[PDB]
């Protein structure tokens, strides 16, 4: 990638330092902390200036790669991340692992209208550690789950539609915290936006064939 091409959300929030809202536990990556969510309201937001870097990256690429490892409580609907209005309450974007529907839901709010699509057949809420690679480009969403499963969906509007200039002045990025009653239940690890790479590159380097 180029400069500012990897954004580790938990690192950005300083959640490993803090103590409230989560427990540090082990995950698939032995070199980094995993986060069992306790009260996602208390996990700090990504700082404004870091979020604006992330926004500029998404705008430039017209897309992103979002990687996440998760161990999600079965039959729960859990927000992986969301862009919450600083206040005129509501969200402008979320990624939700929907264990009720067996989907990964992508929601975007543009000009005060909500546009939501389900990636179907994306049953992430099992007993177990799962690793995802979500590639969003223009109005397309492509989800790889572990190594050998791919599911796709199209958005009503392009992703850069949401990621406008000083989105940072209107919203902040929260991890594991969503709308109403949709906070993540379970463990998360290595929730990272990555730019200037392809899914193929990610998968090859994670040992998939």
Curated annotation (Swiss-Prot):
Induction: Expression is induced by PGE2, S.aureus and lipopolysaccharide. Induced in arteries and lung parenchyma following injury or stress. Expression in vasculature, including arteries, increases in normal aging. Disulfide bonds join 147-208. Residues 41-209 form the Laminin G-like domain. It comes from the Eukaryota. Expressed by platelets (at protein level). Expressed by monocyte-derived immature and mature dendritic cells (at protein level). Adhesive glycoprotein that mediates cell-to-cell and cell-to-matrix interactions. Multifunctional, involved in inflammation, angiogenesis, wound healing, reactive oxygen species (ROS) signaling, nitrous oxide (NO) signaling, apoptosis, senescence, aging, cellular self-renewal, stemness, and cardiovascular and metabolic homeostasis. Negatively modulates dendritic cell activation and cytokine release, as part of an autocrine feedback loop, contributing to the resolution of inflammation and immune homeostasis. Ligand for receptor CD47. Homotrimer; disulfide-linked. Can bind to fibrinogen, fibronectin, laminin, type V collagen and integrins alpha-V/beta-1, alpha-V/beta-3 and alpha-IIb/beta-3. Binds heparin. Interacts (via the C-terminal domain) with CD47. Interacts (via the TSP type I repeats) with CD36; the interaction conveys an antiangiogenic effect. Interacts (via the TSP type I repeats) with HRG; the interaction blocks the antiangiogenic effect of THBS1 with CD36. Interacts with ATF6 (via lumenal domain). Belongs to the thrombospondin family. This is Thrombospondin-1. It comes from Homo sapiens. The gene is THBS1. The chain holds residues 25 to 233 of 1170 of the full protein.
